[PDB]
Amino acid sequence: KFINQYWSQFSKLVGCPEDDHELTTTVFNCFESNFLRIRTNEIFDICVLAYPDSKVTLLELRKIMKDFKDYTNIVTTFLSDFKKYILNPSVTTVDALLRYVKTIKAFLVLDPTGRCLHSITTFVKPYFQERKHLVNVLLYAMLDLPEEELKEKINFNVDMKALLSLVDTLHDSDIIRHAMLYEHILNYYIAWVPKSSYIKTNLFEVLLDLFESREFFISEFRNLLTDRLFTLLDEKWTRCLKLIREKIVKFTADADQSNLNSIDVMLWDIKCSEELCRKMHEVAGLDPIIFPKFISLLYWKYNCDTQGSNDLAFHLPIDLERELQKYSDIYSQLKPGRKLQLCKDKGKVEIQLAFKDGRKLVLDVSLEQCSVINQFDSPNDEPICLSLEQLSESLNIAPPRLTHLLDFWIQKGVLLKENGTYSVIEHSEMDF
Amino acid sequence: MKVKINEVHSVFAWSWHIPSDEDVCGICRASYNGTCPSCKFPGDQCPLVIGLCHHNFHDHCIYRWLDTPTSKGLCPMCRQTFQLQKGLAINDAHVQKFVEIVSRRREEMIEEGV
Amino acid sequence: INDYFIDYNPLFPIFATRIAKGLAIYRVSDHARLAVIPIRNINLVANYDWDTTTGKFLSIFFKDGTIRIHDIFKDGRLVSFLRIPSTKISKGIWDRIPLRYEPNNRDFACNIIDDLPKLIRFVKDSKRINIVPYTQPNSLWRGPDEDDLDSNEKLDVHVVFNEGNDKITVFFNGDYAVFLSVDNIENENSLKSIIKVQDGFYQCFYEDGTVQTLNLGPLLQSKSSVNLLNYIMVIKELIGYMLTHLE
Amino acid sequence: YRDLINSMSDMEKDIAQSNVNSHIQQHILVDLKTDVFAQKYPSSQINLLDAIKLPKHNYIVYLIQVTKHNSAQEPFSEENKKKLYIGTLKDENLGIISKESSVKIPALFKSYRLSSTRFVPNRVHSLLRDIGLSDSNYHSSYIRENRENDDFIACTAKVSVDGRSASLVFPKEKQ
Amino acid sequence: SVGEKNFKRWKYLGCEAYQKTVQILTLIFVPACERIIIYVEKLRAILQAFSIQNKLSYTSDLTAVEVLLKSSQKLLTMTLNSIIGLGRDETLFEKFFIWFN
Numbered sequence A: 001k002f003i004n005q006y007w008s009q010f011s012k013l014v015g016c017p018e019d020d021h022e023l024t025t026t027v028f029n030c031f032e033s034n035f036l037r038i039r040t041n042e043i044f045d046i047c048v049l050a051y052p053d054s055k056v057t058l059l060e061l062r063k064i065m066k067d068f069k070d071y072t073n074i075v076t077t078f079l080s081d082f083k084k085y086i087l088n089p090s091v092t093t094v095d096a097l098l099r100y101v102k103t104i105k106a107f108l109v110l111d112p113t114g115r116c117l118h119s120i121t122t123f124v125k126p127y128f129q130e131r132k133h134l135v136n137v138l139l140y141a142m143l144d145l146p147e148e149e150l151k152e153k154i155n156f157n158v159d160m161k162a163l164l165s166l167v168d169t170l171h172d173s174d175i176i177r178h179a180m181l182y183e184h185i186l187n188y189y190i191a192w193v194p195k196s197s198y199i200k201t202n203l204f205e206v207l208l209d210l211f212e213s214r215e216f217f218i219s220e221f222r223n224l225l226t227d228r229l230f231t232l233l234d235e236k237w238t239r240c241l242k243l244i245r246e247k248i249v250k251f252t253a254d255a256d257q258s259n260l261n262s263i264d265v266m267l268w269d270i271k272c273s274e275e276l277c278r279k280m281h282e283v284a285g286l287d288p289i290i291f292p293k294f295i296s297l298l299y300w301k302y303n304c305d306t307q308g309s310n311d312l313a314f315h316l317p318i319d320l321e322r323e324l325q326k327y328s329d330i331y332s333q334l335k336p337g338r339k340l341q342l343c344k345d346k347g348k349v350e351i352q353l354a355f356k357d358g359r360k361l362v363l364d365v366s367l368e369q370c371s372v373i374n375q376f377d378s379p380n381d382e383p384i385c386l387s388l389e390q391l392s393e394s395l396n397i398a399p400p401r402l403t404h405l406l407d408f409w410i411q412k413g414v415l416l417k418e419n420g421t422y423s424v425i426e427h428s429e430m431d432f
Numbered sequence B: 001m002k003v004k005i006n007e008v009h010s011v012f013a014w015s016w017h018i019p020s021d022e023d024v025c026g027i028c029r030a031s032y033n034g035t036c037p038s039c040k041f042p043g044d045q046c047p048l049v050i051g052l053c054h055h056n057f058h059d060h061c062i063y064r065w066l067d068t069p070t071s072k073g074l075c076p077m078c079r080q081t082f083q084l085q086k087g088l089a090i091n092d093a094h095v096q097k098f099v100e101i102v103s104r105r106r107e108e109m110i111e112e113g114v
Numbered sequence C: 001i002n003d004y005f006i007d008y009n010p011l012f013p014i015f016a017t018r019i020a021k022g023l024a025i026y027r028v029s030d031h032a033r034l035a036v037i038p039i040r041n042i043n044l045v046a047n048y049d050w051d052t053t054t055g056k057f058l059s060i061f062f063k064d065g066t067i068r069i070h071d072i073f074k075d076g077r078l079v080s081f082l083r084i085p086s087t088k089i090s091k092g093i094w095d096r097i098p099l100r101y102e103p104n105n106r107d108f109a110c111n112i113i114d115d116l117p118k119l120i121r122f123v124k125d126s127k128r129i130n131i132v133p134y135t136q137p138n139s140l141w142r143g144p145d146e147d148d149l150d151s152n153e154k155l156d157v158h159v160v161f162n163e164g165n166d167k168i169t170v171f172f173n174g175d176y177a178v179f180l181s182v183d184n185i186e187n188e189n190s191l192k193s194i195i196k197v198q199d200g201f202y203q204c205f206y207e208d209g210t211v212q213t214l215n216l217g218p219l220l221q222s223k224s225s226v227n228l229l230n231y232i233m234v235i236k237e238l239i240g241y242m243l244t245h246l247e
Numbered sequence D: 001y002r003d004l005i006n007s008m009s010d011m012e013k014d015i016a017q018s019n020v021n022s023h024i025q026q027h028i029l030v031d032l033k034t035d036v037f038a039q040k041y042p043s044s045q046i047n048l049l050d051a052i053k054l055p056k057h058n059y060i061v062y063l064i065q066v067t068k069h070n071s072a073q074e075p076f077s078e079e080n081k082k083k084l085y086i087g088t089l090k091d092e093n094l095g096i097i098s099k100e101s102s103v104k105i106p107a108l109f110k111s112y113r114l115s116s117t118r119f120v121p122n123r124v125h126s127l128l129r130d131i132g133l134s135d136s137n138y139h140s141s142y143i144r145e146n147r148e149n150d151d152f153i154a155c156t157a158k159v160s161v162d163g164r165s166a167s168l169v170f171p172k173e174k175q
Numbered sequence E: 001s002v003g004e005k006n007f008k009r010w011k012y013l014g015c016e017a018y019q020k021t022v023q024i025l026t027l028i029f030v031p032a033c034e035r036i037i038i039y040v041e042k043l044r045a046i047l048q049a050f051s052i053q054n055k056l057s058y059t060s061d062l063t064a065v066e067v068l069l070k071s072s073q074k075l076l077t078m079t080l081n082s083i084i085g086l087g088r089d090e091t092l093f094e095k096f097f098i099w100f101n
Helices: A002-014 A021-041 A043-048 A055-062 A068-085 A093-110 A115-130 A134-143 A147-153 A160-170 A179-189 A203-208 A214-231 A235-251 A254-283 A318-334 A367-374 A388-395 A399-411 B059-067 B092-111 C217-221 C223-246 D002-026 D125-133 E003-053 E063-100
Strands: A293-296 A338-354 A360-366 A415-418 A421-424 B002-016 B048-050 B056-058 C014-019 C022-027 C033-038 C045-050 C057-062 C066-071 C078-083 C091-098 C120-124 C129-133 C154-162 C167-172 C176-180 C191-198 C201-206 C211-215 D044-053 D059-068 D083-090 D138-140 D143-145
Touching: A002 A021, A021 A043, A021 A055, A021 A068, A043 A068, A043 A093, A055 A093, A068 A093, A068 A115, A093 A115, A093 A134, A093 A160, A093 A203, A134 A147, A134 A160, A134 A203, A134 A214, A134 A235, A203 A235, A214 A235, A214 A254, A235 A254, A254 A293, A254 A318, A318 A338, A318 B002, A338 A367, A360 A367, A367 A388, A367 A399, A367 B002, A388 A399, A399 A415, B048 B059, B056 B059, B059 B092, C045 C091, C057 C091, C091 C191, C120 E003, C154 C191, C176 C223, C176 D002, C191 D044, C201 D044, C217 C223, C223 D002, C223 E003, D002 E003, D002 E063, D125 D138, E003 E063
Parallel strands: A293 B002
Antiparallel strands: A338 A360, A338 B002, A415 A421, B048 B056, C014 C022, C022 C033, C045 C057, C057 C066, C066 C078, C091 C154, C120 C129, C154 C167, C167 C176, C191 C201, C201 C211, D044 D059, D059 D083, D138 D143
8 A cells, every 4th residue: 555655756756766676675674563563562452452353463473573572572561561451459350360361362372382471471470369369260260150159159249241251262262004104204204394391382271370289279179069069060060170180190299189089089979879879779669759879978078077066957857768768778788888877968859839729839949948848748738837936846957047948938939927927828819 | 738859869978887086097097988099989999898906997008018028917006917807798898808818928928937 | 339529540440438437449340448548537638649640659648747658559558658847738739750861962961870889778687687778768659660661760749738828838759848938928718729730830729719830840851950859868868878877 | 976977967958958949949930829710700709619630631621609799889689699600721821712601500409518519530420330230328319328318419510621521529518 | 704605695796796897887888978979079060050050149158068078078087997996896806705715
């Protein structure tokens, strides 16, 4: 465009012939030098905001930078702008990391080696350790946890559209037999091809570099899997554990293997529970409605032994308790030398609630919640009104804990609180 | 109101029943419910054994200890001849394995003149 | 958050809010508390001013004559304490002027202090007597920021106005004080607002509508005059630095 | 040694006060107080409230209370109204640019001290959206802290100066 | 009174009482006095020039500056004498305790 607009006039001014090749080449060399200069100035907005739309320009930039001074100027300019804007504690930590990882992938595309990423890394980590919630939210971002679990114990709002965006970036994955031996030995051996490494192309490894030790990372990973393997594995975390195992083994400390061992035991515990249950339903003909899981107490980090309050000894329904005891007795028969303990705070039950008006409500409730609602089960169709003191004695549950359990059914529209007594709502005068 | 139970997903925890900070193997110092350093999975893959001296070890820890020439077939905790306690179903699957290792080593001490 | 107060930081998305326990800082985006400045009485505070050049610091003016500045990025911890001799404060403004001293051939005034090795300090801990590099007492809040690439030395000017008499006092670099006497003393008008036009240029608005302009420009375009201001502050520091080690 | 250093320190202050202050003060000029609104308003008593500068703009926005001088020949006229004229002056010479428009105060807002109004820059609109987006004890209809606290007016005066506007807040100090 | 316990303390106190004393004089006092001289000298030059460049009728006397220059010069000369003296004091100090031991 510039040549078509001014070159003829410039050649007329100079008087040199229009076809001066060397002059045009030097002009072209100045243009690309100017293009390098401008992009260096704007590299922050290029990588932070315009990415990935400007990623094509980055490839063009990669064709231009040749000297070590260019890289140093780029990174020192980029770190200057980043810390000027992003490293403010006033910026939300969620968006800060989101823009951070956006820069990481941008520079990785720009720099396959990733040495600049290492330099950017080493400069930026102390600021990350300055923020406190970063570890929790990032690992939750790693495992793609639902927002409901996030909102349960995190007291600051988390931007959902950021969460989806970081998830999408995280899941981005764009990052004759004797004659051939003579040819390949000529084609492979005659065709002449003209602080540790820490510059691996994996973005997740860069993310792992935040922690001074991966021990906390793998420890928290154990906690979340032990939680999830309870609530039920999702395939999405199988990739996560595969990744976490992959780098840790490659590096190889004692505690790292301690938190690396039982994760497959959890898989083994679920696998054995799936297998032992099938053999069990075949041998003694138990109720096929029950699906028990046999877990290794030491490795699930489940503190059944917290030795101080008398409060988990709630009574299960007689029919359900008898069926569960049958499993424990014959487990001792199938596996001699082992005793089976039912974790009463632990478990999920699907119950179907049938009302007099024809409404059927199917919910997944805990063992404690099923025990409370079973107290209102009327075999003789008589309306059961139970006071708080009566329910506490029958179920051996503390009153404050009972109120929370009873509030759950009230919110579900099952129980109604009238004058201190809880009664079943049998007839709803409002469209379901 | 009628309550119908459609499906039950219960969680059970298994632990070793020991015929009574001490629920640890005296050889590997790992928990009985845990794995020895040579085993990965607990339970069947790292079973426990109880000797006549009432000392508990992982199956592989004591077997490895008994396979050493310096052990002389004696318990590492009490120096008594290690023999699996009879009548315990936990020991039933390992009786033949431990009788052989104690017998072979007893023959080796006779052959070595000690 | 409802309040008739709050001044937004021009350079970053923060506001400074006033609550009973003290001055509080919350992020605009998250409404999450960032820092708390413990203040005893609101009535004692004449005004509070933000940092125009950087925004990293914040200024607080006391009616008695005390100036206190705290860093927001540092969880609101106090960084420097200032006093002005026997001055009643109505309302003060904090300005930072970046100097641009470009190399000129006509300027042969070479510097030698830079060539001379920098001094150090003797501080003794419980275990032993240790040796540390020398830092100016006010250098912690004036030092070249790691965060600031354009690390040119910044002139620190604090402008103070006395109530009841409309007396103007300018304070340089935290140590040197200059007193200017206004002739228009006949009326006791309260100063309504202070407005900054550019570096070294200020306009004052009184309740009666009269405008008073303070211009530091002639000081600024004079190379030596600024150097004179710098030299006088240094010599007072070193002599006290000397007396500190003597005792 | 202590005497000599102190002998130096005290006279060092003498050098600072005697000479340096004299030199510095000379390079500092103070403009005489002048009236600019007299030309536009020569028959009105002027009361100034607040005025700030728009960043990246060389114009001075000001809020003034204009009360006409009542001569001794017009007895007790009900025109003694405080008019909150808003104008613009160029930052350098304080020159009037746009004709002042008297903002009409609704009758509901006459019970507030208009003199206490202060300027609030840098996107006051952001808090208005965020107040309703945060489950706090602050309600926007007027931004009110519960039903039992003082009410403060946020007068987002859209003074369109060359296409841009500022924001104002009216504090509550009941008369 | 003295014993072995205090004697080592006496030597430890005495050596630091001299060897550290000379350090602060040579390494702090010497660099500062020269810096004061330089700044004072530059301070004098600035005022003299604007007495001429400005050609303003009122002049500020320089007698305050020259007093500081002389006094500052006196300090450095006085400082060096002490360092020489403390050099002797270390010699006397050591010969005493080697005999006292």
